[PDB]
Ligand binder design. Structure first.
Ligand code: NA
Length: 146
């Protein structure tokens, strides 16, 4: 169970989302715990992009779907706590924690993430997450390509 950090602001809290794009993005990252690439790909536009910085990016719906599906066969996303959400110039930001459990070891990892999203007509045109990948290699049972 994760605690509220000292620097958490109430003015930008998750429960205070107040634009459509923010409400879509908060819904999306909460759906992460479904662990289901079929459900999740429906949120994306055909011309789109997804990257865990600075690993090789995925461009286009097929590549995004394939990479999501590959993640969910080696790792479970158990929790996603969003501390901040906000938006500006057509972009949306989430300051959050994701909890990943390695399916072959059962070990659990807390990742502190700051993510940026771009939407066109309610659909995801880009999604980049920033975090420390030091434990990411051990946590995902897949060769890092970068
Ligand atoms: Na707000």
């Amino acid at each position: 169970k994760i605690e509220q950090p000292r620097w958490a602001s109430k003015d930008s809290a998750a429960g205070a989302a107040s634009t459509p794009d923010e409400k879509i993005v908060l819904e999306f990252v909460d759906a992460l715990t479904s662990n289901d690439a079929a459900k999740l790909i429906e949120y994306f536009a055909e011309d789109t992009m997804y990257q865990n910085m600075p690993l090789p990016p995925a461009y286009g719906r097929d590549a995004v779907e394939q990479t999501l599906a590959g993640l969910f066969t080696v790792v479970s996303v158990d929790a996603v706590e969003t501390f901040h959400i906000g938006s500006s110039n057509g972009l949306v930001y989430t300051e959050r924690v994701d909890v990943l459990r390695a399916l072959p070891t059962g070990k659990s990892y807390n990742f502190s993430i700051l993510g940026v999203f771009q939407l066109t007509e309610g659909k995801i045109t880009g999604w980049r997450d920033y975090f420390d990948l030091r434990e990411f290699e051990e946590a995902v049972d897949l060769p890092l390509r970068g």
